[PDB]
From a paper:
In previous work, we have investigated the binding preferences of a [name] domain that is known to interact with the C-terminus of the cystic fibrosis transmembrane conductance regulator ([name]). The [name] ([name]) controls the apical membrane half-life of [name] and is a validated therapeutic target for the disease cystic fibrosis. We have previously described a peptide array-based approach that enabled us to design a selective inhibitor for the [name] [name] (CALP) domain. The result was [name], a decameric peptide with sequence ANSRWPTSII.
In order to test which positions can accommodate a modified lysine residue without a substantial loss in peptide binding affinity, we substituted residues at the P−1, P−3, P−4, and P−5 positions of the [name] peptide. Each substituted lysine was capped with an acetyl group, to more closely mimic the electrostatic character that would be present following modification with an organic acid (here: acetic acid). Consistent with our SubAna data, modifications at the P−1 and P−4 positions yielded the highest affinities, comparable to or slightly better than the affinity of the template sequence. The structures of CALP bound to each of the substituted peptides were determined by X-ray crystallography, for comparison with the structure in complex with [name]. As in previous analyses, co-crystals contained two protomers in the asymmetric unit. The A- and B-protomers are superimposable for all crystals, except for the complex, in which the P−1 side-chain amino group is oriented towards solvent in protomer A, but forms a hydrogen bond with CALP-Ser302 in protomer B (distance: 2.9 Å), suggesting a dynamic interaction. For example, a P−4 acetylated lysine interacts with the CALP α2 helix, whereas a P−1 or P−3 acetylated lysine faces the opposite side of the peptide binding cleft, and a P−5 acetylated lysine can access either side of the interaction pocket. The other three sites are negative, and S−1 and S−3 are more negative than S−5. For proof-of-principle studies, we chose to further diversify the position with the highest baseline affinity, i.e., P−1 in , by introducing three halogenated substituents. The modified lysine and the terminal moieties are oriented similarly in the complexes with and with the additional P−1 substituted peptides.
Residue numbers in the entry:
A (entry chain A): 284 to 370
B (entry chain C): 4 to 10
Write the structure that this text describes.
Amino acid sequence: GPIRKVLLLKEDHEGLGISITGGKEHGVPILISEIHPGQPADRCGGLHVGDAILAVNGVNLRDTKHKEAVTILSQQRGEIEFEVVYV
Amino acid sequence: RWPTSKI
């Protein structure tokens, strides 16, 4: 599908509200495997299971290993911009 | 086969 830019708002007491799988060491993108109900990704409205996370706040995640992506994603705070695509 | 992390 089309590449999309999606905005997510989150306080500091919460996580993103997603589960991710995949990563460069597995030969696949960072993929959203769960959107947890009522948490920030769900509330944002624009992120869905099956989306590949291409970048977050301008940080490319297309060639990142799983745990690299966890560190990068969990560091983001407040108003967080995602670039995603559903294939 | 792939890992999953809740974040």
